[PDB]
Design a protein around this ligand. Structure first.
Ligand SMILES: *C(=O)N1C[C@H](NOS(=O)(=O)O)CC[C@H]1C(N)=O
Length: 265
């Protein structure tokens, strides 16, 4: 942990003002420095777990490049709680490229389940996380139950530190092949659900890729790769969860956390 005293004070005050539990990690990839707040506690990942799932599928495509263009039938039975793209393909097919874009950029939960099926389930996403040196990530359930976000429950959690290091290896480093890393980074940059989260706290000119998540207990999450103008990229994880199951989401908390980390860099 390389966090400055001032940044700790600011993140602590933000957490208290928001009445929740905040977890933040920032990696400066130029120096390798890592900093943050509660960055080793488990937090429910919710939809941010989808990055690891798509990455696992992209790793498999390295040995079968046509895998991503293979049509996959979509059925009404695949639909769950939130299916913004897949609901339009019932009775038709989507490729794994389309399914990956849908789950990353629109957070389509049926698409996530179709990807989990191809990989062999949540347990195989966890095995892929281990294969990139992430010993904290655990995916236990599929959609939509992986979003229950119960305090004290270890299912479907990771830590801000582990998720930041994994997102660095996947989107910037060498955990994936070049074609696959660039596809993942492009999909993250094209996310449509992140305007009010990390992106809102960063300079408007910077290029950003991110994946949000939400769940019960007011869980409000975002993980980002940031390409600041003129200087090496940053990786930012902001996880936030609240005391009561019915709590409302607090996206401005993530924006402010991002602004706090962005200033100190
Ligand atoms: C992911 O956390 N989920 C799927 C979808 N995500 O959209 S979000 O990232 O903009 O929050 C809706 C919320 C959540 C879920 N409960 O399924």
């Amino acid at each position: 942990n390389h966090i400055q005293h001032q940044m700790v004070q600011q993140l602590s005050a933000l957490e208290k003002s928001a009445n929740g539990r905040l977890g933040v990690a920032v990696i400066d990839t130029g120096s390798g420095a890592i900093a943050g707040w509660r960055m080793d506690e488990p937090f429910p990942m919710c939809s941010t777990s989808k990055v690891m799932a798509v990455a696992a599928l992209l790793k498999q495509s390295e040995q079968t490049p046509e895998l991503m263009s293979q049509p996959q039938p979509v059925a009404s039975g695949d639909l769950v709680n939130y299916n913004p793209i897949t609901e339009r393909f019932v009775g038709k097919s989507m490729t794994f490229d389309e399914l990956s874009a849908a789950t990353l950029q629109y957070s389509d939960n049926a698409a996530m389940n179709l990807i989990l099926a191809k990989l062999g389930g949540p347990q195989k996403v966890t095995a892929f996380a281990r294969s990139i040196g992430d010993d904290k990530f655990r995916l236990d359930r599929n959609e939509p139950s992986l979003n229950t976000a119960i305090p004290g429950d270890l299912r479907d959690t990771s830590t801000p530190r582990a998720m930041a290091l994994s997102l660095q290896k996947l989107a910037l480093g060498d955990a994936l092949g070049q074609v696959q890393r660039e596809k993942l980074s492009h999909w993250l940059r094209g996310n449509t659900t992140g305007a009010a989260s990390i992106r809102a706290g960063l300079p408007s000119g910077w290029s950003v890729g991110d994946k949000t998540g939400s769940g019960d207990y007011g869980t409000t999450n975002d993980i980002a790769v940031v390409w600041p103008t003129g200087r090496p990229p940053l990786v930012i994880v902001t996880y936030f969860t609240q005391p009561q199951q019915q709590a409302e989401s607090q996206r401005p908390v993530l924006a402010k956390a991002a602004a706090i980390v962005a200033s100190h860099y």
